[PDB]
Amino acid sequence: GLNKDQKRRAEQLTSIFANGTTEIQYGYVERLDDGRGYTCGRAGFTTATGDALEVVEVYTKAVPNNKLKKYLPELRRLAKEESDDTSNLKGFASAWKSLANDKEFRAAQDKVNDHLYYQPAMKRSDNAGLKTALARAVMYDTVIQHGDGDDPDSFYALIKRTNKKAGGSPKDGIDEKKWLNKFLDVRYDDLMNPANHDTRDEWRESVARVDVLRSIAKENNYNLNGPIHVRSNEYGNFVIK
Numbered sequence: 117g118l119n120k121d122q123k124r125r126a127e128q129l130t131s132i133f134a135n136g137t138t139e140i141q142y143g144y145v146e147r148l149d150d151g152r153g154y155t156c157g158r159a160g161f162t163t164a165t166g167d168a169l170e171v172v173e174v175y176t177k178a179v180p181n182n183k184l185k186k187y188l189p190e191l192r193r194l195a196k197e198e199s200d201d202t203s204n205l206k207g208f209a210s211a212w213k214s215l216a217n218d219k220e221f222r223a224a225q226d227k228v229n230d231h232l233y234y235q236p237a238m239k240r241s242d243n244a245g246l247k248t249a250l251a252r253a254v255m256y257d258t259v260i261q262h263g264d265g266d267d268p269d270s271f272y273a274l275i276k277r278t279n280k281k282a283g284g285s286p287k288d289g290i291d292e293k294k295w296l297n298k299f300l301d302v303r304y305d306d307l308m309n310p311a312n313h314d315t316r317d318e319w320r321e322s323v324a325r326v327d328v329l330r331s332i333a334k335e336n337n338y339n340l341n342g343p344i345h346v347r348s349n350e351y352g353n354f355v356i357k
């Protein structure tokens with residue numbers, strides 16, 4: 117996978133793309149009007165897509181009778197229905213934000229992120245034969261935004277479309293740097309015109325993350341060494357140690 121430094125750098129890139137800061141925002145909650153209800157915390161776990169529910173489940177297992185427990189029935193219905201409704205989540209956004217610095221709530225988010233995003237990104241990276249930290253970091257950021265579902269905008273759909281366009285994966289012998297450049301092209305195209313129309317407007321404004329990641333490749337920093345300087349017209353300027 118990614119070593120301690122590389123993983124932190126990958127996460128700080130993802131944090132810039134999600135929140136305009138290298139400080140991971142565990143307390144973030146916002147309705148984006150992208151069909152996902154509330155988008156929350158370090159991964160942008162959402163109330164429509166099932167993963168905010170998982171965070172609250174994991175937190176409730178560790179800390180019974182916490183301030184978010186009462187939202188479980190509505191969160192469960194929202195996940196079942198893939199619903200954008202936030203009208204029956206009064207107080208949820210403020211309660212989530214109030215736990216931004218809570219050790220157990222942060223740990224619950226880290227656990228769900230590891231299970232849903234980091235481990236699947238590293239597993240699919242292994243399946244594709246990716247050897248570079250930068251490629252693995254791109255996969256990690258990609259699964260966070262796109263999810264690991266079965267739909268045409270999903271992480272694995274992007275991998276398969278890249279493999280087709282590139283003539284194979286790096287495991288098959290395709291040069292990993294060329295493959296990653298094609299992957300970034302495929303991801304850009306998906307963000308500009310996703311199959312999921314609800315997210316088209318939001319995702320079109322996120323394409324700058326592809327250029328930030330490509331700029332690391334163009335510096336030939338495939339080991340994701342630090343410091344990294346992000347120089348983005350969209351997000352601004354950042355340093356990542």
Ligand SMILES: N[C@@H]1[C@@H](O)[C@H](O[C@@H]2O[C@H](CO)[C@@H](O[C@@H]3O[C@H](CO)[C@@H](O[C@@H]4O[C@H](CO)[C@@H](O[C@@H]5O[C@H](CO)[C@@H](O[C@@H]6O[C@H](CO)[C@@H](O)[C@H](O)[C@H]6N)[C@H](O)[C@H]5N)[C@H](O)[C@H]4N)[C@H](O)[C@H]3N)[C@H](O)[C@H]2N)[C@@H](CO)O[C@H]1O
Pocket residue numbers: 132133134135136148150155158159160161162165166167232260261262263264265266315318319321322350351
């Ligand atoms: N102009 C910039 C702005 O862009 C910027 O604003 C930020 O912009 C971000 C990008 O738009 C935005 O991010 C959103 O939030 C998160 C990412 O942080 C995204 O949310 C994810 O969306 C996925 C796709 O819908 C969801 O997918 C689901 O994933 C799960 C888990 O993998 C799948 O479940 C699996 O299913 C399989 C098969 O059934 C099964 O085998 C597995 O076991 C299951 N685990 C689902 O199938 C899948 N649908 C995902 O759950 C969800 N978390 C969202 O897409 C992003 N748009 C930021 O929020 C926004 N603030 C600002 C920043 O300051 O700057 C401006 O300048």
